[PDB]
Design a protein around this nucleic acid. Structure first.
Lengths: 469, 253, 162, 414, 59, 363
RNA sequence: GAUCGAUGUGGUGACGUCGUGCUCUCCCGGGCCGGGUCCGCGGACCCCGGCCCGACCUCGCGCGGGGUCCUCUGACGCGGCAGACAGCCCUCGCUGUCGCCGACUUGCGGGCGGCCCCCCUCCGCGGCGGUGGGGGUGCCGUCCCGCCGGCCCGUGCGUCGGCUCCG
C-alpha cells in the first residue's frame, strides 16, 4: 500500500465570516480621497472602454478619470447649482439639471450646452435618457414629468400626477418609453407604454429617495427611509421583500455588473451588499462620512462613494500529443507535509518540534492539536514530551496557556497537561519561569471551572423555561 | 529525432525523438506505412533501442529515473522506476548486449552498472577513474569497453568485474563515442578533434599504447556517433555540432 | 503494483456535525442605559456594545433590561450567544447578563412569544461546553498538589616573568 | 563503533578467501581516532579519554583473567595533596593549581544520615603557571606554609601566610638550577627539610628555614635499569627516606647520617605506592600486581605478618583487580589497622584478624580485609583524624558533560 | 581539523541532548539532565529588535 | 521487490464486529476485512473482489495499542447509501465515536463522503438499520445506543445559493424508561419500528413518531429481533437471553406462541416466510426452519457444525429452485450461508497479440 | 565497578514541487485603549475584549515632516545557472543574468487542445450514467514565426555599407 497522512480535524464555527463573497469584496486596495467643494449629489460612470466618472457638486460638474486626482474636465457655467449628471449609453453626451428648470445636453468634449429645454418652471433634479439614445425624460419640482426629443428640440409629452417634489427618475434599457419616476409624495408611478396616463402605481411608506430597475425579470427596487422594498411586475404591485438593515435613511441604491449583487448606500456611514436570490445581507462596508452617492465601474473594478462633505472616496482593485498517438499517463508525485514526513520515519520528537513552531501555533493551531492527538493515538506522547529542558517545555506551556480554554481543543490538551505534570514534577523548584507558567495555567483552570458552574446554573433555568411550554 | 533503429528480424523501423511519441513503421521504399504510435506524458526520449531478440522496446528520458519497457508480444508497458540496490538519480545513457543477457547503465563518479535483461535486477558495479563518456559491449558479449573523460579507455570482464587492460587513445583529450564490429576485428574510438582511430581488437587487449590502423582526419568537429555495418565493410561517422558532418568509411581499405 | 484496496474520496465538501451546532441534535437617573443598548443593537458597532454590555453591577443590568424595549430582546439574545464563546474573563459577565435577563424581566414574558428554537441553539451550545468538568477537576487537583510541592578564589595569582 | 574484519574461506574445499565484517563493539561514546592490533587483542583509543583493550577469544591460547576486557579512564598516580593540620586540599591540573579548605559540621547522626554543615567548602587559592609547559608534580607542606611544584624547565616554591583571614604568597628569590625538572616533591613532617627527586637519577635534600634555602646533600643515582618513575616516602620521625623506580629495588636512606641504610629485595612488578608506619617505622609497598609487602626499616627484613600473608597468599578476588593501589595511609593511634584505596574500592586491613582463604568471600554487597565500595569512583582518600576521613571522588557523567560534541544517533523509542 | 569534524554540514548534537535520550525511554520519565539553561535567562531585549517584522505576519 | 499478484479468498480478522451483508449492486458478500477496511468478496468463486477503506489512517502493529475499530455498517436505498460506524475506546470514561455517510457516484463508480458526524451518541452504538421500503418519500436511518437514546436521521436538502447539495439532518430523538436500546428493526412497509429496551420491546409508528404498543414478556433481555415477511408480515419474532423464542401478533397485540429454544443466529428470508434459527447445543449447532404462523418446525437439521456459528445470512438466488416437499421448500427461494467462530463459511447443498505476425515470430 | 565466547539493542520503498530540505539553529513577541483580578486607595498581573508595530538617513520645529530602500532567523545542502567542442560528476563559482546607478527577465499577437453552466437524441440489468447535438461571458495550458542572429565600418541610421550565419 502507501503511507497515509495524519487526519486534520476541522471544527465548524457558528459565524460565516469567511465567505467567497468576502474574498471578492475585500480584494480592493486602500481608499483614496479627493477633495471637493459642496455636497456630492451623484457620481455616474460611462460605459465606454475609457471608463471615467462625472461627479456633480454645487454648481460644478467635474469629469474625473481613473486615478487622476485633478478633474480631467469641468463644466462650471451653471448659474446656481447643477443636478443629476448622467451619461448616455455611447458615452458621448450627458444630461444635466439646474435649479432654474432648464434641461441641458452637454458634449463630453465641449464647453457650452448643445440643447437647452425651458419647459419647467422650478428646479429640476432628475433627468435620464431612454432605450433609444435620442429622447430624454426629466422631472422637476413643479410636480410634473416631461418627455423631450433631442433632434426636434421640443417637448414630446407632459405628465402631471404627483403631489410633492419629484426628484428620482429611472428608465428601462430594454423597452423605450417605459420609465419610472419617484417623488416625496410617498408614491412611485410608472409612466409608460404609449398612453397619456400611468398604468401602474406603487405606495411607499416614506418619501422615496431612490428607485432602480433590474434589467431582467421586471423587478423594481425602491428606497424610503430605512426601508428598501422590492416590487414585481409579473403581477402588478407585488411587494416581494421589504428589508431594513440601516439605522438611518437609505440614500442611494445601485446594481452591480452581476445581477446577483445589489449595493445599498445610506446616511449612516454604511453600505450593505445583498444577494438578490436570497435577499439577505452578504457584505458590509464602513466609511468616514454619510454616503450620498454610490457608483460602480465595469465588473466591480472601481467603487466611488460621494459623501455629505466635499471629499469622496475611490476604491480600486513542451510538445503536445498528436491525435493519432496513444496516450500514456505518468503518475504525479504527491508532496507530503514536513510533519507527515517525520511521522513516516518515526521522528516523533521532531514532528512535535515542528508543530510547536510559533507560526504554526498562531496561524493553524488545529494542525498542532491534530498532531498531539495522533501522538496520543500512537501512545508515544510521553516519549516526545519528556527529555526537554526549561526552554523547550516553556513554549509548550505557553501554547497550553493560550489554547487550553478553547472548547474544541480541551480534551487532548488537558491530557497533555496531565502528562507533562506527571513527568516534570521533580524538577519544578529550580526554574522560576516554569513556576510562573504553571501558575497562569492554574488560574485559567479555576476561572474556566467557575465559568462552567455558572453555565450549569443557567442550564437549569433554561431547562425550566423550556419545560414550561 | 533522438534515435532510429531497424528491427533485427522484421522490416520494422522505430523512430523516437524529443517529442514524447515513439513510433513503429513498416519498412517499405515507397510509403512506409505506420504500424503504431505511443505518446508518453512527460517523457522526452533521450534514447530508444530494440532488445537483442527484438521482442521488447526500451526507452529512457532526459533527467528521469524511470525506465520504460514495452513488451510487444504480451502487450504490456512496464515502467521500471525503482531498481533495487541502485543509487543513481537519473537514467539516460545505457547499452544492450548483442546476446541479450545483459544491460549496462552509465552512471556518475565513473560507475558502470550491470543489470540482468530478463529481470532488470542489478548484478554488480564497475568504477573507473574519471567520468564515463561512452561504453559498448564486445561482439562475444564477454567484455566491456569503457572510454573515460581523460582520453583513456578501460576493458572490463563481464563475468568477473575486473579490469583486464588499460590502453590510451592517441591524441585524445577526451573521448565521446566508441564502437565495435560484429566479427570482432575492429574497435573504433571517437575524440574531440574529430579524429576516429581504428584498432585491431587484439592490439587493445595486450598493448598499453596501441597504434591505430588508420586515423580518420576527414571530420573536423567532435565525433558523437559511431556505427558499424553488419557485414563489416562500412563505418559511419557523424558530428552533430556542424551541418553535413557525416561520412562513410570503407573498412578493409 | 497489484493491491486490491479501493479508496473512497474524502474531500472538503462533506458536512461535519459536532454536538455544538444545530444539526447534531433534535425622575432622572443613570440607573439604566436602554437607548444606548438599542442603538448598539441596531448597528453592530463593537465599541458601544462593549461599553453597554461589559459591566458587572447587577442592578444596572436589572434596570437596563426592565427599561428596555420589548421587541429587541432577541437581538440581545443573539449578541450574548455570540459573545459567550471566549475566554472566561469576558464570558462570566455575559453569563451574569444572561442570568439577569432570564431571571427577573422575562421569567413570565418569554413563555409568550413561543420562540423556543432561538434559545435552543444556546441550550445545545451550553450543554456541549459543560462536558469537560470532571477532567478539569482532576487537572485542578493535580495542579494543587503540584503547587503544594512548589512551596571562586579570594586571591587569584598570576606569576610574573623573572 | 569498532569493527572487526576477518579473512574467511568461502567453502572448506576451496582455497579462495573473502573479507567479511564479523564483530562490532561499542565501548566509546565519542570519536575513535586510533586503533591498534595486538597479536591477541584489539586496542582502541578515542577522544572520550578511554583506553580499551579487548582480547579476541579465538586467538587466546589459555582462558584466564588475561582474556578479560580492560578499560582505563582514571590516572594511575595521585594528583591530590593534603594538609591535615589546617584542613587543606591541593589539586593539580595541567597549567594551574587549586587550593581548598574543608568545611566542618556540628550535627550528629547514626548509620546513613546526612549531617547539616556549619561552614561550607571554601576555595582559597588559584595559581596559574607561565608558559605552555605542563606541571609535572606538586606538593603541600604538612604545616601548610610551603607550596612546591615543578615543570620541565623551572621549579617554583612559595611561602604563603594566612593572615587577617587572607592568603599571601611570596616566591623565593632564587632556586638552584639542578631542581629544574623534579619527578617527585616530598615534604617532611616538619617544614625544615625538603626532598626532591630529579628527572635523571639524583636525590636532593634542601634546608628550609625562615624563607632561606640550603642544598644539604645530593644522593647519587641508584644503580640499575630505570623501570618506572620514582616514588618518595618520608618517615614521620624524619629519620628515613624511601625511594623506588629502579630494577635494584626500593632503597632506604638515613637522612641524619646522609648515607644509604638498606635496600628492599627487588620485585619484578613495578611499585605503585609506598608508605611508612608512624611508630613501628614499617614500609608498606604496593605493586602493579595486587600483592603487597611490609618491611621493617630497623630490622632490615620482612615482617612476620608479611611473611604469613606471602606464604598463605592473597585471595583470588583481590588479585583479579584492574586498578592499582594509589594511596596508603596510617594512623598513630591504631598500629594494627592500615588503610589503602584503589579507584573502585577502599580497604582497611587488620593484621591481628585471621587471613581469608579462597573458600571464604572477600566482599559482601573474622575477616582481615574490610573492603568497601560505597564511593565508587575514588581519586583520593585520607585519614583526616582518628574519626575523620576525606574522600575526593569524580563521577563519570561529570567528565562526560565536559567533552566535545558527539555524532547524532537515531534511537528507536524516540 | 576543526571544520572537518565540527564545521557546518556535520551531524553533531549537544552533550546535554545526547545524554537526555536515555531519560525519554526510562520506566519513570525524567526531564533533561541539565534542566536550567543560562543563555535563556540572560537575554531579554535583543530578541525584540531583530524579529519585529515576523510577528506582524503571524497575527 | 514489488507486488505482482495476490492470491486470497476470505480475509481472516480477529473479530467480525459487523454482520454478513450483501451489496445490492454487485451481489457480493460484504464484511470486515483488513483493519479499517470492509472486504467485498465474490460468493460464486472463492476470490476476493476488493477492500474498501473507511478510515484512511496509518495502522501500526505495535502491541498494547488501542486501535480504531469499524463496528457497524449498513446499505440504504438499494446500494446508493452506505453508513459506517467507527469507535476508539482507550478508557471506559471517554469514547470516540464517528459515523459516516457515503453516496455512490456512478460517474466515478466509487463512494464519496457526504456527511460526517463525530460523537453521534455518548455511548457505543448497538444497532444500525435502513428503511428498504421504497414507498417512504425520504430515506431514513435509525441509530440506537447504550446511552438510552435512539436517534432518527433523515436526508434533507442542503442547497444554498453558492452550491447545490444534499445532506443528513437529525429528525427525531426517542427514549423509554432510561433503558439501554439493544436492537431496532423496521417493518416490511416501514410504517412501524420495533425497538428493544433490554427485556421489553416497544412498537412505534414511524410516520408520526408516536408510540403504538409495548410488549413485556417476563422472560429475559432480547438478543434478536425481527419482523415477519410476505404472508407472515403481521407477525413479529423475538428471542430472549433465557432461551425463549416468542411470536407476537401486531393485529391482536398479543403473543401467539412461545418456545424453549436458545438461538444465537436468527435470519429472516427476504423472499419467503421461512425463518431459520441456529441453536447452540452442547454437542454442536442445530438448524430449525419454520414459519411464524405455525408453531411446529418445517425442517430440522442437527450436527451442521461442531463449532459455534457466529453469523448467518440469506442470499436471493437468481434462478429459483423447485422442491415440492414442504421440508425442502425453503431452499427454493434463497441460499443460506453461515460463518462460524473459526471464520469458515458454510452453506447447504442438495447436490490481442498481432505482433507475433508483425515481428516475424512465425518466421 | 567491569569482567574470561564477548556482536552498535531494535522504526517503514518508489515516478521532475527544475525553489526547495526526515539537516542544525534564531525568537517565543512589543507599544494602546475597554475591562477584570491579586497584592500591599496605591501598584502588579490577565482577557478567541478590541487596537496598532519594517530598517535607514536627512531637513525643519528631543518632536514632527520628507525621502532611500523596502520579499526577511541565519548557515549548510539540494535544484538551477554560469563557465570546457565535454561536466546530473568539476569549481575558493553565482543563487535572476548583466552592464557601470541603469537595460533585461516583456509586449501584443496568431493557433491548437482540456475540462466544465444548461436544454434536445441513442444505448444501458436502465436508482442514474455514458453516447450523440447544441447553446454558457468559459475559463485555461501548451507551439512556433515573432522583432533571423553574429562581427567590422560609416553616419538612430546607413538602396543595393561588407564578411558571415540563419532561413
Amino acid at each position: 500500500a502507501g503511507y497515509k497522512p495524519v487526519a486534520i480535524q476541522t471544527y465548524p464555527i457558528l459565524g460565516e465570516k469567511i465567505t467567497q463573497d468576502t474574498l471578492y469584496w475585500n480584494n480592493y486596495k486602500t481608499p483614496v480621497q479627493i477633495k471637493e467643494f459642496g455636497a456630492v449629489s451623484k457620481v455616474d460612470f460611462s460605459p465606454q472602454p475609457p471608463y471615467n466618472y462625472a461627479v456633480t457638486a454645487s454648481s460644478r460638474i467635474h469629469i474625473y478619470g481613473r486615478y487622476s486626482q485633478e478633474p480631467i474636465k469641468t463644466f462650471s457655467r451653471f448659474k446656481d447649482t447643477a443636478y443629476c449628471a448622467t451619461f448616455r449609453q455611447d458615452g458621448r453626451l450627458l444630461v444635466a439639471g439646474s435649479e432654474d428648470g432648464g434641461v441641458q445636453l452637454f458634449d463630453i468634449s465641449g464647453r457650452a450646452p448643445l440643447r437647452q429645454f425651458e419647459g419647467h418652471t422650478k428646479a429640476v433634479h432628475t433627468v435620464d435618457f431612454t432605450a433609444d439614445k435620442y429622447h430624454v425624460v426629466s422631472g422637476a419640482d413643479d410636480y410634473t414629468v416631461k418627455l423631450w426629443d433631442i433632434p426636434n428640440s421640443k417637448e414630446i409629452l407632459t405628465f402631471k400626477e404627483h403631489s410633492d417634489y419629484v426628484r428620482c427618475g429611472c428608465a428601462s434599457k430594454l423597452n423605450p418609453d417605459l420609465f419610472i419616476t419617484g417623488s416625496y409624495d410617498h408614491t412611485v408611478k410608472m409612466f409608460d407604454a404609449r398612453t397619456s396616463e400611468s398604468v401602474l402605481s406603487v405606495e411607499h411608506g416614506q418619501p422615496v429617495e431612490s428607485v432602480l430597475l433590474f434589467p431582467s425579470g421586471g423587478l423594481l427596487v425602491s428606497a424610503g427611509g430605512r426601508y428598501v422594498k422590492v416590487w414585481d411586475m409579473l403581477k402588478g404591485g407585488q411587494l416581494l421583500v421589504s428589508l431594513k438593515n440601516h439605522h438611518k435613511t437609505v440614500t442611494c441604491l445601485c446594481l452591480s455588473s452581476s445581477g446577483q449583487r445589489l449595493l445599498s448606500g445610506s446616511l449612516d456611514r454604511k453600505v450593505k451588499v445583498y444577494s438578490t436570490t436570497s435577499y439577505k445581507v452578504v457584505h458590509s462596508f464602513d466609511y468616514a462620512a454619510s454616503i450620498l452617492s454610490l457608483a460602480l465601474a465595469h465588473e466591480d473594478e472601481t467603487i466611488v462613494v460621494g459623501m455629505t462633505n466635499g471629499i469622496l472616496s475611490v476604491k480600486h482593485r513542451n510538445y503536445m500529443k498528436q491525435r493519432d498517438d496513444i496516450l500514456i499517463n505518468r503518475p504525479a508525485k504527491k508532496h507530503l507535509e514536513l510533519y507527515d514526513r517525520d511521522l513516516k520515519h518515526f521522528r516523533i520528537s521532531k514532528a512535535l518540534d515542528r508543530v510547536l513552531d510559533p507560526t504554526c501555533t498562531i496561524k493553524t493551531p488545529e494542525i498542532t492539536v491534530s498532531i498531539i492527538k495522533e501522538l496520543n493515538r500512537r501512545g508515544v506522547l510521553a516519549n516526545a514530551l519528556a527529555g526537554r529542558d526549561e526552554k523547550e517545555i516553556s513554549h509548550v506551556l505557553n501554547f497550553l496557556i493560550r489554547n487550553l480554554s478553547q472548547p474544541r481543543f480541551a480534551p487532548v490538551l488537558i491530557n497533555a497537561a496531565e502528562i507533562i505534570i506527571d513527568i516534570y514534577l521533580p524538577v519544578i523548584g529550580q526554574s522560576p519561569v516554569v513556576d510562573k507558567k504553571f501558575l497562569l495555567l492554574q488560574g485559567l483552570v479555576e476561572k474556566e471551572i467557575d465559568y462552567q458552574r455558572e453555565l450549569l446554573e443557567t442550564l437549569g433555568m433554561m431547562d425550566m423555561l423550556f419545560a414550561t411550554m | 529525432i533522438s534515435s532510429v533503429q531497424f528491427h533485427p528480424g522484421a522490416q520494422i523501423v522505430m523512430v523516437a525523438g524529443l517529442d514524447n511519441a515513439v513510433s513503429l513503421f513498416q519498412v517499405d521504399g515507397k510509403t512506409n506505412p505506420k504500424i503504431q504510435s505511443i505518446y508518453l506524458e512527460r517523457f522526452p526520449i533521450f534514447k530508444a533501442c530494440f532488445s537483442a531478440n527484438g521482442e521488447e522496446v526500451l526507452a529512457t528520458s532526459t533527467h528521469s529515473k524511470v525506465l520504460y519497457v514495452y513488451d510487444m508480444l504480451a502487450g504490456k508497458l512496464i515502467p521500471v522506476h525503482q531498481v533495487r540496490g541502485l543509487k543513481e538519480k537519473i537514467v539516460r545513457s545505457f547499452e544492450v548486449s548483442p546476446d541479450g543477457s545483459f544491460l549496462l547503465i552509465n552512471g556518475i563518479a565513473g560507475y558502470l552498472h550491470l543489470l540482468a535483461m530478463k529481470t532488470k535486477e542489478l548484478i554488480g558495479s564497475m568504477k573507473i577513474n574519471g567520468r564515463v563518456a561512452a561504453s559498448t559491449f564486445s561482439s562475444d558479449s564477454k567484455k566491456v569497453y569503457a572510454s573515460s573523460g581523460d582520453g583513456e579507455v578501460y576493458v572490463w570482464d563481464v563475468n568477473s568485474r575486473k579490469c583486464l587492460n588499460r590502453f590510451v587513445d592517441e591524441g585524445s583529450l577526451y573521448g565521446l563515442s566508441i564502437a565495435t564490429s560484429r566479427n570482432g576485428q575492429y574497435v573504433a574510438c571517437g575524440s574531440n578533434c574529430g579524429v576516429v582511430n581504428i584498432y585491431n581488437q587484439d592490439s587493445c587487449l595486450q598493448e598499453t599504447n596501441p597504434k591505430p590502423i588508420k586515423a580518420i582526419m576527414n571530420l573536423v568537429t567532435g565525433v558523437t556517433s559511431l556505427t558499424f555495418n553488419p557485414t563489416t565493410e562500412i563505418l559511419a561517422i557523424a558530428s552533430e555540432k556542424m551541418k553535413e558532418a557525416v561520412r562513410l568509411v570503407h573498412l578493409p581499405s | 503494483a497489484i493491491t486490491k484496496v479501493r479508496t473512497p474520496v474524502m474531500n472538503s465538501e462533506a458536512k461535519v456535525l459536532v454536538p455544538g451546532i444545530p444539526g447534531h441534535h433534535a425622575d432622572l437617573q443613570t440607573n439604566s442605559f436602554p437607548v444606548l443598548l438599542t442603538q448598539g443593537l441596531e448597528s453592530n458597532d463593537f465599541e458601544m456594545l462593549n461599553k453597554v454590555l461589559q459591566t458587572r453591577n447587577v442592578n444596572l443590568i436589572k434596570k437596563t433590561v426592565l427599561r428596555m424595549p420589548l421587541h429587541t430582546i432577541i437581538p440581545l439574545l443573539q449578541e450574548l450567544t455570540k459573545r459567550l464563546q471566549g475566554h472566561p474573563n469576558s464570558a462570566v459577565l455575559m453569563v451574569q447578563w444572561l442570568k439577569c435577563v432570564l431571571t427577573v424581566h422575562a421569567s413570565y414574558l418569554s413563555t409568550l412569544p413561543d420562540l423556543v428554537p432561538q434559545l435552543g441553539t444556546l441550550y445545545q451550545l451550553m450543554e456541549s461546553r459543560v462536558k469537560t468538568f470532571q477532567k478539569l477537576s482532576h487537572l485542578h487537583g493535580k495542579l494543587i498538589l503540584l503547587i503544594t510541592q512548589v512551596t571562586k578564589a579570594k586571591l587569584v595569582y598570576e606569576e610574573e616573568s623573572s | 563503533t569498532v569493527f572487526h574484519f576477518q579473512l574467511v574461506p568461502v567453502t572448506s574445499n576451496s582455497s579462495e578467501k573473502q573479507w567479511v565484517r564479523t564483530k562490532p563493539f561499542q565501548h566509546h561514546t565519542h570519536d575513535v581516532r586510533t586503533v591498534a592490533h595486538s597479536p591477541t587483542a584489539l586496542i582502541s583509543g578515542g577522544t572520550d579519554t578511554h583506553l580499551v583493550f579487548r582480547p579476541l577469544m579465538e586467538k587466546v591460547e589459555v582462558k584466564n583473567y588475561d582474556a578479560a576486557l580492560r578499560k582505563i579512564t582514571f590516572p594511575h598516580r595521585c594528583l591530590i595533596s593534603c594538609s591535615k593540620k589546617r584542613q587543606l586540599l591541593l589539586f593539580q591540573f595541567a597549567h594551574h593549581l587549586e587550593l581548598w579548605r574543608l568545611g566542618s559540621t556540628v550535627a550528629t547522626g547514626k548509620n546513613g544520615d546526612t549531617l547539616p554543615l556549619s561552614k561550607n567548602a571554601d576555595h582559597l587559592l588559584h595559581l596559574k603557571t607561565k608558559g605552555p609547559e605542563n606541571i609535572i608534580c606538586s606538593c603541600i607542606s604538612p604545616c601548610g606554609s610551603w607550596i612546591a611544584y615543578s615543570t620541565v624547565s623551572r621549579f617554583f616554591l612559595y611561602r604563603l601566610n594566612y593572615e587577617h583571614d587572607n592568603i599571601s604568597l611570596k616566591r623565593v628569590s632564587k632556586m638552584p638550577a639542578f631542581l629544574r625538572s623534579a619527578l617527585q616533591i616530598l615534604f617532611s613532617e616538619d617544614s625544615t627539610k625538603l626532598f626532591v627527586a630529579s628527572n635523571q637519577g639524583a636525590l636532593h635534600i634542601v634546608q628550609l628555614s625562615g624563607g632561606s634555602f640550603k642544598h644539604l646533600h645530593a644522593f647519587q643515582p641508584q644503580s640499575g635499569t630505570v623501570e618506572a618513575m620514582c616514588l618518595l616516602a618520608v618517615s614521620p620521625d624524619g629519620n628515613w627516606l624511601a625511594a623506588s623506580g629502579t630494577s635494584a629495588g626500593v632503597h632506604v636512606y638515613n637522612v641524619k647520617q646522609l648515607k644509604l641504610h638498606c635496600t628492599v629485595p627487588a620485585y619484578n612488578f613495578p611499585v605503585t605506592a609506598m608508605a611508612i608506619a608512624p611508630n613501628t617505622n614499617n614500609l608498606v609497598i604496593a605493586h602493579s600486581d595486587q600483592q603487597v609487602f611490609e618491611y621493617s626499616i630497623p630490622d632490615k627484613q620482612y615482617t612476620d605478618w608479611s611473611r604469613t600473608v606471602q606464604k598463605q597468599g592473597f585471595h583470588h578476588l583481590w588479585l583479579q583487580r584492574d586498578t592499582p593501589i594509589t594511596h596508603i595511609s596510617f594512623h598513630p593511634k591504631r598500629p594494627m589497622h592500615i588503610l589503602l584505596h584503589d579507584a573502585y574500592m577502599f580497604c582497611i586491613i587488620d593484621k591481628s584478624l585471621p587471613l581469608p582463604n579462597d573458600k571464604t568471600l572477600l566482599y559482601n554487597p573474622a575477616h582481615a580485609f574490610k573492603i568497601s565500595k560505597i564511593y565508587k569512583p575514588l581519586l583520593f582518600m585520607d585519614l583526616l583524624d582518628e574519626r575523620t576521613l576525606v574522600a575526593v571522588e569524580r563521577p563519570l557523567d561529570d567528565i562526560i558533560a565536559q567533552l566535545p560534541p558527539p555524532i547524532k544517533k537515531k534511537k528507536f523509542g524516540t | 581539523i576543526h571544520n572537518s569534524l565540527y564545521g557546518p554540514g556535520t551531524n553533531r548534537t549537544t552533550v546535554n541532548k545526547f545524554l537526555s535520550l536515555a531519560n525519554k525511554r526510562l520506566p519513570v520519565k525524567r526531564a533533561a539532565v541539565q534542566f536550567l539553561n543560562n543563555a535563556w535567562g540572560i537575554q531579554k531585549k535583543q530578541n525584540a529588535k531583530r524579529f519585529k517584522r515576523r510577528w506582524m505576519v503571524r497575527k | 521487490l514489488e507486488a505482482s499478484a495476490v492470491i486470497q479468498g476470505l480475509v481472516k480478522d480477529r473479530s467480525i464486529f459487523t454482520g454478513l451483508m450483501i451489496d445490492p449492486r454487485t451481489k457480493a458478500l460484504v464484511l470486515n476485512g483488513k483493519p479499517g477496511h470492509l472486504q467485498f468478496y465474490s460468493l460464486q468463486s472463492d476470490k476476493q473482489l476488493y477492500n474498501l477503506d473507511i478510515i484512511q489512517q496509518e495502522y501500526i502493529n505495535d502491541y498494547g495499542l488501542i486501535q480504531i475499530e469499524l463496528t457497524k455498517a449498513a446499505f440504504g436505498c438499494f446500494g446508493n447509501w452506505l453508513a459506517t460506524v467507527e469507535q476508539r475506546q482507550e478508557k471506559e470514561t471517554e469514547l470516540e465515536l464517528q459515523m459516516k455517510l457515503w453516496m455512490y457516484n456512478k460517474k466515478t463508480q466509487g463512494f464519496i463522503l457526504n456527511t460526517k458526524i463525530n460523537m453521534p451518541h455518548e455511548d457505543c452504538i448497538t444497532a444500525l438499520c435502513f428503511c428498504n421500503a421504497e414507498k417512504s418519500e425520504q430515506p431514513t436511518l435509525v441509530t440506537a445506543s447504550k446511552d438510552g437514546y435512539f436517534k432518527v436521521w433523515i436526508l434533507t436538502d442542503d442547497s444554498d445559493i453558492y452550491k447545490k447539495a444534499v445532506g443528513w439532518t437529525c429528525d427525531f430523538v426517542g427514549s423509554y424508561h432510561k433503558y439501554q436500546a439493544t436492537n431496532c428493526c423496521f417493518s416490511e412497509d416501514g410504517s412501524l419500528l420495533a425497538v428493544s429496551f433490554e427485556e421489553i420491546v416497544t412498537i412505534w409508528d414511524s410516520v408520526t413518531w408516536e408510540l403504538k404498543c409495548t410488549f413485556c414478556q417476563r422472560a429475559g433481555k432480547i438478543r434478536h429481533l425481527c419482523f415477519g415477511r410476505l404472508t407472515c408480515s403481521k407477525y413479529l419474532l423475538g428471542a430472549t437471553e433465557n432461551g425463549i423464542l416468542c411470536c407476537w401478533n401486531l393485529l391482536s397485540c398479543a403473543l401467539e406462541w412461545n418456545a424453549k429454544l436458545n438461538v444465537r443466529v436468527m435470519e429472516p428470508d427476504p423472499n419467503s416466510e421461512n425463518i431459520a434459527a441456529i441453536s447452540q447445543s452442547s454437542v454442536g449447532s442445530d438448524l430449525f426452519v419454520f414459519k411464524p404462523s405455525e408453531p411446529r418446525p418445517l425442517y430440522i437439521q442437527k450436527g451442521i457444525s461442531r463449532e459455534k456459528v457466529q453469523w448467518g445470512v440469506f442470499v436471493p438466488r437468481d434462478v429459483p429452485e423447485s422442491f415440492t416437499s414442504e421440508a425442502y421448500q425453503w431452499l427454493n427461494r434463497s441460499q443460506f450461508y453461515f460463518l462460524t467462530k473459526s471464520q469458515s463459511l458454510l452453506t447447504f447443498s442438495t447436490k490481442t497479440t498481432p505482433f507475433y505476425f508483425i515481428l516475424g515470430k512465425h518466421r
